[PDB]
């Protein structure tokens, strides 16, 4: 980026910049990800595959399109992207599990396998042991575990009103 002119640019530049964007996404530094992404020229962000795949992957992650995020594992425009993508998949497994925790008053197992994108009941059982589930007594993971006036804070606010009125 520094030595514009006096240099002819390297064809590997866009690929390696996209790899850096993948690294930033994997480490979950979204602000720095977007900041560096802004460095890429417009048409480079919009057309070049190496810069489109990282940005599209962030778009899918923000939307929740975990299916397409997983399909990125097959997309992989450059094979070197696998390393920074595997850790992102594991973090996304955690994020999907959090979504499942909050939603899904009740969920089964045979379909929860596809939902979590796992391929083995042993992996399913290990992951359930991770964090902790009810194992599906009726084959259903029933993780349905869902006053107190802030009187102190409200009194502080009202006293602030009084003080701001009386310092006249």
């Amino acid at each position: 980026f520094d030595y514009k002119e006096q240099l002819p640019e390297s064809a590997y530049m866009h690929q390696l910049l996209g790899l850096n964007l993948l690294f930033l996404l994997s480490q979950n530094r979204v602000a720095e990800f977007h900041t560096e992404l802004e460095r890429l020229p417009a048409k480079d962000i919009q057309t070049n595959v190496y810069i489109k795949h990282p940005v599209s992957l962030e778009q899918y992650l923000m939307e929740g399109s975990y299916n397409k995020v997983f399909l990125a594992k097959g997309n992989i425009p450059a094979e070197s992207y696998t390393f920074f993508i595997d850790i992102l998949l594991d973090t996304i497994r955690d994020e999907i599990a959090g979504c499942i925790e909050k939603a899904y008053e009740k969920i089964l197992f045979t379909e929860a396998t596809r939902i979590l994108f796992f391929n083995t009941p042993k992996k399913m059982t290990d992951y359930a042991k991770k964090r902790g589930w009810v194992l599906g007594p009726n084959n259903y993971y029933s993780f349905a575990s869902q006053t107190t006036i802030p009187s102190t804070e409200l009194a502080k606010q009202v006293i602030e009103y009084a003080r701001q009125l009386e310092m006249i």
Binding site: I149, T152, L154, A155, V158, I159, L165
Partner: protein, 155 residues
């Protein structure tokens, strides 16, 4: 309003004497009043300066006057009465807002008499609106704080 006195001697005031000795500059009481001067001050009697004794102990009880018990300190106003008062006061605020819009309009328009002879005998929307906001805001803030303190302490 209180004053101490002693009488001047007719004998001395006819035989040319001042029946008071001016060793100090403490003869500046209040520039004695015209009432006293015409009723016989400095001729037949003189005024003696008056002071008071402060003990800081009687003053404690004199301060205890006007004091309110903690019952009154922590009591909440009848909520129905409070709501009715807020409703009414906001109604007068609405009317005074109409009148304030009217007055601000015809205020800069002309100021020959706006200085002093444009509010005498007529309501002042700005002044009454200020009074209403002051009173209602005091009441509401105080009752909110009382309610919150009560909700916690009486738990």
């Amino acid at each position: 309003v209180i004053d101490a006195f002693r009488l001047i001697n007719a004998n001395m005031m006819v035989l040319g004497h001042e029946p008071r000795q001016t060793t100090s500059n403490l003869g500046h009481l209040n520039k004695p009043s015209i009432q006293a001067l015409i009723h016989g001050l400095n001729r037949h009697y003189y005024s003696i300066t008056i002071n008071y004794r402060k003990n800081e102990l009687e003053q404690k009880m004199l301060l205890n006057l006007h004091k309110k018990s903690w019952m009154e300190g922590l009591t909440l106003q009848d909520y129905s009465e409070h709501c009715k008062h807020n409703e009414s006061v906001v109604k007068e605020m609405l009317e005074l807002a109409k009148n304030y819009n009217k007055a601000v309009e015809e205020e800069d328009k002309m100021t020959p008499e706006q200085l002093a002879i444009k509010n005498v005998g007529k309501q002042d929307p700005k002044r009454h609106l200020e009074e209403h906001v002051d009173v209602l805001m005091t009441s509401n803030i105080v009752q909110c704080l009382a309610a919150m303190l009560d909700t916690v302490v009486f738990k």
